[PDB]
Structures are given as C-alpha cells and as structure tokens.
Amino acid sequence: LKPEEHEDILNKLLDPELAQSERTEALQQLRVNYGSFVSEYNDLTKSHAHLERMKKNMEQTIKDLQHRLDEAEQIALKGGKKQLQKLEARVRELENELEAEQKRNAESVKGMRKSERRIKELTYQTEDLEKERDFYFGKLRNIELICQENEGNDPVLQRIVDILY
C-alpha cells in the first residue's frame, strides 16, 4: 500500500464511533496489506540474494576469460608465416647434429674395442717377452756366477767378464 493510502486508513480508526464492521474490515485491509508487503520484501531479499550470487560467478568468469585472453594474445605473438618455417630450418639443423654427434660417438667406441684388441694383445706380448728376457738373464747369471771365483786372471775369462758388464 502507498504511504498516503495507509494514512487514509489510519485516520479513519481515529474515530472511536466507527461502526464495528467498517473497523474490522479496515483492520483486515491492514492485515492483508502488511502480509502482502512482508511477502514482497522477502521475495526481494531472495532475488537480491540471487543477483549477488550471479555477480559472484560472473566475476570469476570474466577473470578466467581475461587469463584465457592474455595467453591467447601472446600465443599469437609467435610469428606469422616467416618465423613458422624458420623453425623447420632449426628442426634439421638439429637432426644433423643429432646423428653427427651419435655417429662420431658410436665410432669413438668402435675406437674403444679397436683399442682393446691391442691393449690385451700388448699384455700377451709384455709377458712372454719378459719370459724370454728372464730366460736369458738366467743363463747370463749362471755364466756370470761361474765367471766369478776365477777372477784371479784368465785372459779368456777376462774378456768374457768384460762382456758381462
């Protein structure tokens, strides 16, 4: 009810000689009207509550959009048609070095057991050679053990001794 439309009811109960019927029906008006605006008000608090929620969800949307926009603006910064196919000038400036630095490595351990086929061959040689050396040293110092004692002074034994040292 309007502000005026209320007052016009309130200043008609002011008369204490008001017929009980008119009184009861005026009070009825007050009741249904007050009920009506309680209902309306509550509806407005529920509706206002709705907008407040939608506002809470539309903000989160907007924000997300901004983010999704930002990245999408910088993704489009990555070259038109020239920087595109420049990358393929990279992908096989790499595929080159990719095989070159695995062809040369694979080779380098071809060098690994090219090198072992002789470092284990040069152990087979370093031992039998030392065996022969040891043999001739054995003979040498048998002979040399004999060339002692008789130092006092056979000419022939003196030239052999001269050979021994």
Place this chain on the structure above:
Amino acid sequence: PLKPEEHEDILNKLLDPELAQSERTEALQQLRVNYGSFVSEYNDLTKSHAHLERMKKNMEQTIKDLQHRLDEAEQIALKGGKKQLQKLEARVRELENELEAEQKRNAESVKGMRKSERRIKELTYQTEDLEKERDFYFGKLRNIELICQENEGENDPVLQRIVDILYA
C-alpha cells in the same frame, strides 16, 4: 520492522469497540511508524537491488566482449599456423633433448678412454724396453759364444761348463 505476530496482537488492540482513546492513538502511531520504517528499508533494498541489476548488464556485456576478443586471437594465431608451429616446437625440444643426451654420453666415453689408451702408450713402452733387455742379454750371450768359438785350446773345465750353458 516488527514481525507479523506483533503486528497482529497490535491489530487485536484496535477491534475493542470502546478501547481507551489514548491507547488507540498510541496503536495507530505505532502502525504508522512501523510502516514508515518498513517502507524506508524496502526502498533501500530496492535501491541496492536495482544496483545489482545495473552491474549485471555491465558484466554481461563485458563477457560478450572478452569472448569475442578471445575468439579473434584464437583465430589470428590459428591462421598464422599454430598447430604446425607448436608441432615444430614439439620436435625442436625433443631433438635438443636426445642430442643433449648423446653429447653427454659422448663427452663421457671420450673423457674416460683417451683416459684409457695412455695405457697403450705405456704398455707399448713396456714391450720395447723389456724387448731391449731381451735383445741385450741375448747379444751378450751370443758374444760369449763367439769367444768360445775363438778358442784354440780344448775347453778348460770352467770354459767347458760355460760352453755347456751356452745352449738355449
């Protein structure tokens, strides 16, 4: 803004056919004040509510803006080759990766095996001074042998023993 039960038990204090007039005026005043309050607070809620209505139209238009812009960017990127471009960056980084891998493993068994074949350059050494010793001792032996073949007299017991050794 009193609850409707209170409004009601007020409304019961007005149907009394001959209530004290002062109480009647008091009641009606109560009603008018309460209604004034209800109206004002409702006008406040109407003000606030109308506000949200406005900032809902502003935000709805903003989204409609952003969305469009987004599409635009997603189209400009896509028309400039986005799927093929990134697909190259998928390969560039992969190749960089395994190339790095093989640079690493190469760097290692190029490190620890010219680190390995100083041994040859040592072993070789070992097989040529030893050799020398051999070819040295032998020499001397054969030298003595020649001296024993340069003897006119029959082998004196000592020289006979030495000659007897000189078989190998």
